[PDB]
Amino acid sequence: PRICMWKYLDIHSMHRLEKAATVEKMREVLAELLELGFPEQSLRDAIILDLFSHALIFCRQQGFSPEQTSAACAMLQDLHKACVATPLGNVEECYRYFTSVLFCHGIRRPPFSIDLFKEEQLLALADYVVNTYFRHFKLYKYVFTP
Amino acid sequence: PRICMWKYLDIHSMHRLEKAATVEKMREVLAELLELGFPEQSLRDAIILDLFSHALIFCRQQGFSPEQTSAACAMLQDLHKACVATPLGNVEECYRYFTSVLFCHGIRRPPFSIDLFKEEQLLALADYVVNTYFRHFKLYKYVFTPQVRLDLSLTYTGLQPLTLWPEEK
Amino acid sequence: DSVERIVENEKINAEKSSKQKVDLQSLPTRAYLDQTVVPILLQGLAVLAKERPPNPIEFLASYLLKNKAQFEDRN
Amino acid sequence: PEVINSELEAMMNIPSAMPTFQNLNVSCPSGLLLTFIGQESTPTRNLMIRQSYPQRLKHYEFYKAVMPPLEQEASRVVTSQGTVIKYMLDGSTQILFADGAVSSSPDSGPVYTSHIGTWFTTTPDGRRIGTKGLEKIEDLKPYLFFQATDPINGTVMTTREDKVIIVEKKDGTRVVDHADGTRITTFYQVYEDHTVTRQVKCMRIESSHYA
Amino acid sequence: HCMVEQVVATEEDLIPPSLVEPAPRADGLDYRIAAHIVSILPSLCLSEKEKKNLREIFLTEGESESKALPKGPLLLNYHDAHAHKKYAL
Amino acid sequence: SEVYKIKFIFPNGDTYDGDCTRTTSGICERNGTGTHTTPNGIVYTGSWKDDKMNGFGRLEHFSGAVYEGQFKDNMFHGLGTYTFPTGAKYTGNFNENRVEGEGEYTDTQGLQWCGNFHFTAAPGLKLKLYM
Numbered sequence: 001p002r003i004c005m006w007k008y009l010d011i012h013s014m015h016r017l018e019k020a021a022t023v024e025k026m027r028e029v030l031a032e033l034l035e036l037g038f039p040e041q042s043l044r045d046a047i048i049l050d051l052f053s054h055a056l057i058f059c060r061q062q063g064f065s066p067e068q069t070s071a072a073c074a075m076l077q078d079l080h081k082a083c084v085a086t087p088l089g090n091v092e093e094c095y096r097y098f099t100s101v102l103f104c105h106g107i108r109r110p111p112f113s114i115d116l117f118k119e120e121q122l123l124a125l126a127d128y129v130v131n132t133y134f135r136h137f138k139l140y141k142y143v144f145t146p
Numbered sequence: 147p148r149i150c151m152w153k154y155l156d157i158h159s160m161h162r163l164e165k166a167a168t169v170e171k172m173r174e175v176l177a178e179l180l181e182l183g184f185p186e187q188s189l190r191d192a193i194i195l196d197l198f199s200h201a202l203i204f205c206r207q208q209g210f211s212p213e214q215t216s217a218a219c220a221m222l223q224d225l226h227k228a229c230v231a232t233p234l235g236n237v238e239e240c241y242r243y244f245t246s247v248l249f250c251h252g253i254r255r256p257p258f259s260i261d262l263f264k265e266e267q268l269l270a271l272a273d274y275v276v277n278t279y280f281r282h283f284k285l286y287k288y289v290f291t292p293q294v295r296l297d298l299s300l301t302y303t304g305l306q307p308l309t310l311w312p313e314e315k
Numbered sequence: 316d317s318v319e320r321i322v323e324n325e326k327i328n329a330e331k332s333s334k335q336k337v338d339l340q341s342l343p344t345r346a347y348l349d350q351t352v353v354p355i356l357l358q359g360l361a362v363l364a365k366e367r368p369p370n371p372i373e374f375l376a377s378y379l380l381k382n383k384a385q386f387e388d389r390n
Numbered sequence: 391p392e393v394i395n396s397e398l399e400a401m402m403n404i405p406s407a408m409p410t411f412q413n414l415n416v417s418c419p420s421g422l423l424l425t426f427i428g429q430e431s432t433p434t435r436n437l438m439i440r441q442s443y444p445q446r447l448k449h450y451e452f453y454k455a456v457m458p459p460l461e462q463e464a465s466r467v468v469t470s471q472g473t474v475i476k477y478m479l480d481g482s483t484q485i486l487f488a489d490g491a492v493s494s495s496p497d498s499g500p501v502y503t504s505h506i507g508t509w510f511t512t513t514p515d516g517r518r519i520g521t522k523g524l525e526k527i528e529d530l531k532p533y534l535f536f537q538a539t540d541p542i543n544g545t546v547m548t549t550r551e552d553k554v555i556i557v558e559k560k561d562g563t564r565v566v567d568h569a570d571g572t573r574i575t576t577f578y579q580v581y582e583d584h585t586v587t588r589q590v591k592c593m594r595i596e597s598s599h600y601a
Numbered sequence: 602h603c604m605v606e607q608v609v610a611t612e613e614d615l616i617p618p619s620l621v622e623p624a625p626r627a628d629g630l631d632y633r634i635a636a637h638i639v640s641i642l643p644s645l646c647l648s649e650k651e652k653k654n655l656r657e658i659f660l661t662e663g664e665s666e667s668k669a670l671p672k673g674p675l676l677l678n679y680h681d682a683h684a685h686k687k688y689a690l
Numbered sequence: 691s692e693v694y695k696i697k698f699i700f701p702n703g704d705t706y707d708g709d710c711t712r713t714t715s716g717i718c719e720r721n722g723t724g725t726h727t728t729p730n731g732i733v734y735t736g737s738w739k740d741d742k743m744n745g746f747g748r749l750e751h752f753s754g755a756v757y758e759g760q761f762k763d764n765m766f767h768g769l770g771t772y773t774f775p776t777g778a779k780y781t782g783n784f785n786e787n788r789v790e791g792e793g794e795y796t797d798t799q800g801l802q803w804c805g806n807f808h809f810t811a812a813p814g815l816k817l818k819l820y821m
Binding site: 277 | 642643645649652654
């Protein structure tokens with residue numbers, strides 16, 4: 001559990017994503033940035049690109065500050081890697097792992113954390129997170145695990 | 147597009163599901179009704195059981211009557227079958243099919259459509275299948291389309307040594 | 316044929332925003348403001364905040380009257 | 391209309407020392423824009439009303455992820471005969487008629503070139519016609535339709551597979567509600583000439599977000 | 602007001618709010634795919650208690666602040682236009 | 691090397707119709723474009739070099755197997771398309787009549803599969819979706 005700000009997407013790549021006002025151009029930019037291949041040759045890269053693209057779309061729908069953008073993107077990538085790091089059912093371990101990771105961003109105590117965020121947005125995630133992916137955990141498990 | 151009230155789950159099975167209060171025994175009764183094997187032996191049955199388990203646990207509040215319940219429930223099952231019917235991409239066609247059956251369950255016109263769901267409810271139902279089963283469409287496509295990695299064995303006849311020009315005679 | 320020509324005209328009108336002055340006098344408040352004064356006002360406010368003259372109203376009016384040609388003819 | 395002063399223009403060149411119809415524009419605080427356009431018949435002009443949302447064209451992507459694709463309209467224009475010509479925000483064109491026929495075109499180019507425009511037409515009885523310029527698209531499955539008749543007043547229903555309901559009464563009144571919520575009512579209203587009582591065809595177009 | 606916020610953001614290099622992901626998670630993952638789900642949710646199979654427990658765990662705890670229906674059923678003054686804008690919004 | 695167009699009938703029943711060059715010893719040899727036909731039904735039409743079929747050409751067998759691509763020394767080498775009698779086709783690289791490297795297999799139903807090919811094996815061929 002560390003600070004994931006400007007870890008995978010920097011300010012320049014985020015500005016490129018910001019200039020892409022349309023869904024398709026932004027999907028192209030994300031594919032260029034993530035070093036993913038064409039979605040038509042591999043389904044895994046297509047799934048990852050769709051996930052990140054829609055993520056940016058709804059994050060557009062609400063509205064926040066850029067360091068939050070990079071923190072959320074890097075945390076998504078890290079927890080996806082953790083969920084697909086082992087083939088065994090590992091829902092609760094990733095659950096608690098990133099539960100610990102929150103406090104490294106939601107409460108102000110440096111250098112282990114920093115107060116970039118608000119309680120309402122947090123709880124919004126608790127909400128959306130436990131709503132979708134650990135429900136669809138087996139879907140990504142069947143794809144990204146040996 | 148047809149009315150699918152009690153198409154798959156009847157009032158007895160749904161009485162059993164409603165009596166189930168917790169998620170775990172809900173999933174067990176589903177696997178009993180779904181005729182699915184144990185989730186530990188087949189990942190496809192595990193995925194289907196999780197889909198229908200999140201089906202039962204969600205709709206358990208704001209309120210669909212068991213009628214609208216089995217309606218939307220067979221909606222999800224039928225569009226699952228339609229989406230997994232071909233390995234080729236059919237996102238738009240399955241989308242239109244779902245919306246057609248949606249308005250069959252939202253509009254009052256017997257014997258082809260029944261006023262079963264409300265307008266807030268019907269817009270919400272439209273909001274359902276849009277909002278994973280056409281983005282997770284690739285996940286379910288990879289799972290339930292006899293795999294995308296098929297094997298092959300080749301047996302082809304090569305070039306036999308062609309008869310060279312006989313020496314001049 | 317009339318329907319097809321109307322479709323083509325709607326295509327052209329969606330491709331070309333009607334910037335005619337009488338058409339501007341009817342556009343909604345946000346749409347009327349965005350196409351008329353919003354960018355020049357934002358530039359004037361940015362210059363005012365960067366410079367901060369003791370006469371802010373006069374400076375903003377001067378900027379509007381000076382840079383009106385860069386926003387009235389681009390439309 | 392001004393006159394350019396030729397002498398003033400002929401002075402500036404210092405030699406180097408080296409509409410028939412006036413359109414009324416109406417707007418709603420909700421963002422709806424209305425314009426009366428008088429099309430000259432190929433005076434007697436046919437009045438035509440254009441309704442559009444300028445903000446939807448500017449912020450296309452915000453509304454793309456908010457309102458359903460069936461309501462992602464940029465502009466709709468209503469004829470004097472009832473042909474509702476819809477412009478969706480993605481560049482396609484959908485056409486709604488008073489008899490239940492629905493026409494669509496994803497690219498929305500020319501129909502018949504004597505880009506190539508692809509057009510699909512669904513007849514009120516369910517038959518579908520699709521062309522791409524000069525070639526006709528085959529194997530187009532017609533939409534299944536059903537007919538129910540009121541046994542008391544004799545008013546005849548027909549709802550097509552695309553959620554297009556057609557209401558026809560015995561007095562000639564036809565009410566059609568398309569899939570997008572736009573209702574075209576082909577009703578009638580008597581007119582007295584100074585008374586003689588004549589047969590003046592009228593109609594009504596209803597839409598949840600349009601005048 | 603949004604003019605002024607635009608200038609302050611430009612001077613302070615504050616990236617516009619929208620095209621922005623945010624605040625990480627105490628059960629753990631990213632932002633979106635339940636704006637899919639919280640929109641997917643409402644069409645499923647059964648009774649009268651788990652959609653809002655899965656719309657308080659699955660529609661935000663911040664919006665789980667469901668006041669006792671005081672929003673719109675309320676008397677508004679003939680000259681109080683701001684109280685009307687607070688209900689529709 | 692002067693090139694002649696001749697119609698030669700081989701003693702074993704083979705027939706050739708194409709370009710040929712006479713060497714310094716006088717032996718006539720298939721150089722250039724030519725068509726060869728065997729009594730068993732195998733017919734070739736393509737380029738020739740040093741009495742050997744080298745370069746681009748097309749081969750058809752009696753059983754219906756049709757190969758079309760590059761050739762070097764009486765043998766499948768380089769990019770080529772091999773059509774099976776059942777209607778399936780392979781498009782990829784060839785090396786000594788051996789199917790090697792990345793390739794493409796289309797089954798009898800028109801589905802196209804991509805992946806590595808190893809002579810007589812093609813494990814884990816990925817379905818190519820056309821959208």
